[PDB]
């Protein structure tokens, strides 16, 4: 599922921008995040003792568009070869084909990037791939199919990608819409909207 409902009401409830429906009217003010302080008290009357990590667990899911059962499986595979769930977990999410199509700039949102992958428009090493959870490795070449290379939103997404922070671990050419992974993303750069004592005891908590 993709939730398919109104988006900005989620980011406002998390006091954090989730990049949902981002671009154009969503850059430079009028997103209104953390600007409604209420008429009396913090509206935490109450509220739940486990609210952290519980809302942080929805945040880290919703901000990549990743579902519980797959996120729990990421937390299990991330431990292999001494990978550490405090490091490899985030680098696996950033290494997704739907995030790589978003970081190469062909989608303005991770949803828009996913909707290029599933709609049979994306290739990895010349082979067509429709799996948004495909893990891109330090030798993979990612590109678009000829039927989609001239689409309006794809060209508009590249006009936003050049204003976004540069992902130094990859290469891309916009005239062919073809790029290559050169390094795995690293925690010394890869930084997220999550607190440092949270999601390090994920599940059973």
């Amino acid at each position: 599922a993709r939730y398919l409902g109104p988006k900005l009401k989620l980011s406002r409830r998390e006091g954090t921008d989730l990049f949902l429906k981002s671009g154009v009217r969503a850059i430079d003010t009028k997103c209104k995040i953390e600007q409604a302080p209420g008429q009396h008290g913090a509206r935490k009357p109450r509220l739940s003792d486990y609210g952290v990590q519980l809302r942080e667990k929805q945040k880290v899911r919703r901000i990549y568009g990743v579902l519980e059962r797959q996120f729990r499986n990421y937390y299990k595979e991330a431990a292999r070869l001494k990978g550490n769930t405090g490091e490899n977990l985030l680098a696996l999410l950033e290494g997704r084909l739907d995030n790589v199509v978003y970081r190469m700039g062909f989608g303005a949102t991770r949803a828009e990037a996913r909707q290029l992958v599933s709609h049979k428009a994306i290739m990895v090493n010349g082979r067509v791939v429709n799996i948004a959870s495909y893990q891109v490795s330090p030798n993979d070449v990612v590109s678009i199919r000829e039927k989609a290379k001239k689409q309006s939103r794809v060209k508009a997404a590249l006009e936003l990608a050049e204003q976004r922070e540069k992902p130094t671990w990859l290469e891309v050419d916009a005239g062919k819409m073809e790029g290559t992974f050169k390094r795995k993303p690293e925690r010394s750069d890869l930084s997220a909207d999550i607190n440092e004592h949270l999601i390090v005891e994920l599940y059973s908590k």
Partner: peptide, 8 residues
């Protein structure tokens, strides 16, 4: 155990 997320 291993150090990084080992607390637990």
């Amino acid at each position: 155990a291993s150090e990084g997320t080992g607390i637990i």
